[PDB]
Design a protein around this ligand. Sequence first.
Ligand code: DCF
Ligand code: DCF
Ligand code: NA
Ligand code: ZN
Ligand code: ZN
Lengths: 334, 334
Amino acid sequence: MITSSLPLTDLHRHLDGNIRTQTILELGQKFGVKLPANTLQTLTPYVQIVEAEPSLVAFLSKLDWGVAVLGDLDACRRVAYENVEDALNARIDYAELRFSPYYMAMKHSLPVTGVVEAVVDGVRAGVRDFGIQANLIGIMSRTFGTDACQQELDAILSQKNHIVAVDLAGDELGQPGDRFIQHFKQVRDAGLHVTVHAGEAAGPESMWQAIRDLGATRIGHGVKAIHDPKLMDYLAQHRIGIESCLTSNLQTSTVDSLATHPLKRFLEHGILACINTDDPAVEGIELPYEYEVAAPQAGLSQEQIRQAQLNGLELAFLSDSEKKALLAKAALRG
Amino acid sequence: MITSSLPLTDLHRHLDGNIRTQTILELGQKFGVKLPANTLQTLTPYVQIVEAEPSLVAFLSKLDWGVAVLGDLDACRRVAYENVEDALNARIDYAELRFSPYYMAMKHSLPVTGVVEAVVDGVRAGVRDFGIQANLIGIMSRTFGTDACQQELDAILSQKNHIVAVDLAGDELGQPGDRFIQHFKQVRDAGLHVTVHAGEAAGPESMWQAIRDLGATRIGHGVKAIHDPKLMDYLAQHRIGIESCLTSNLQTSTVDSLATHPLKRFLEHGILACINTDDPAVEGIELPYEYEVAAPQAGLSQEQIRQAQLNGLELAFLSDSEKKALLAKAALRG
Ligand SMILES: OC[C@H]1O[C@@H](n2cnc3c2N=CNC[C@H]3O)C[C@@H]1O
Ligand SMILES: OC[C@H]1O[C@@H](n2cnc3c2N=CNC[C@H]3O)C[C@@H]1O
Ligand code: NA
Ligand SMILES: [Zn+2]
Ligand SMILES: [Zn+2]
């Protein structure tokens, strides 16, 4: 259960893996994109996980129809705006929305810098209209190779005043993190924070590399650390964040069952693990369900769920002043 | 792929497991039913399978919120009507819609005979407005016991001029078929056809009991027959229909993977097996997806998928005249 008197964060939330099916249908029709189906219920299985996919890359294909309908920059602004509304309705007080502008732009060859600007505009309008707090994380989609990721990084950095961090996401096995060392040097020299998807499809060596050579202070998933006691020791004493995504790990077959998900053992090890959605529309979940159903099925007690909620606040890419303010604001509730 | 020049049937399709999430929200608000969430995206994981459930009854719990909002007889009429529109939109030419009026009625204590009449009315209005062909199958929900099922059967038979068959559905292992012998004697005495959910959670012994003691000429699922070579010979020799539900069997964990689903081996044994949805809204699928994605993943060639499509026509609870007319109507398309 969500604790009302604590801020509720979502720190690992892909806005371009969270496109409403109704929006896919409308933009698909607006741009003449031939979709596999033409009603909400018949399109649902093509844009949403039906049962667990056998791999991370099989799961990633489910996001494709959502970005296939981004026919102009206004479409990207719309999806970004709608994502702020969805975060509000999911009870989130502070959301970090991550997005890959290269991935969003590639089906209709949109200008990647234009896509970054449109997403900034859409989230800014959404924050104004819906009243939650939000920050942006730019993703380098490793899947498309280092050259595409450099083009994507250039676009992200041109709006660095509005973006708090850069992420590495996509096909972890096919494009290991040691190919992006010089990309993340540019990220840190620009003063941005670093989170990295690691230890999901690949093993603990990917997490070590992200920590040591990419400068990650948060890791997306990180579930393979359960096999590396020294790594779990390091995560705890260096306060590296673990962005846990329970349903996502099931649906990529990264974790065979919630009963064996490592989140509970991470928390028992004093690791700063937090609870997140990942790709809510693709997965068919939202944040309250992860708290109310998934986390108890992963064996967490209510005390452990509250600890994880607090960890999300501590891990946010915010100043301590802003974290203080969020805690003090939520403490008046409940 | 669906074969356009062939009739498309759905013979195993629970109307009370196919209630639109938007309709759940609207009726929930109408009748003051406190739902676990209040928007489409947040309510979805509570009314739809997220990943495979560990058991049949864990899957069945996903249906509860849809029937919890059936606050009056007109709500039942509405979801029956909306079910015909959904079948039309799923490209179905002939649907057999099955429903448990006792289950629909129990949350708000509706008159069970009233629910049956409302469902007949709604499907009749839908068949008029949407133009497909449909029949009704009344379900005894074994889950609630022999007395409840007798009351349910009485209500179904009061409309037997508008219902073609009676089914047994629910918790198969908790309420075995041998408890309902007298119920299905009444079904056959009234002249109705018999289909039985069997060989899903229990073994092939349950399928034998349905055939020999309940008089079933079609079996819902029947996936455990793959372990009984004598039963497979019998199914083929006696033309006993097998109503296959690919996604459903994954989501109940009845079958470990589509590649190991028995549908392909059934067809190769000459068994009349057909492709169906089961509970499309709960599963997050629809019939074209089963044909286009699930069936190839189950290893079927296009030739076998076509044979399964023809098998659905042959297994329909229709006269040979009506089957000929369906074939003739579809033959002009493509
Ligand atoms: O935001 C879109 C980009 O992120 C990837 N992406 C989206 N969701 C995930 C991704 N990557 C890796 N792991 C699985 C899950 O956490 C796809 C695309 O490149
Ligand atoms: O029509 C609603 C009734 O049918 C049951 N029911 C609904 N879907 C299924 C059911 N039963 C058994 N097997 C799994 C799947 O095929 C639930 C309720 O009793
Ligand atoms: Na779902
Ligand atoms: Zn992610
Ligand atoms: Zn069924």
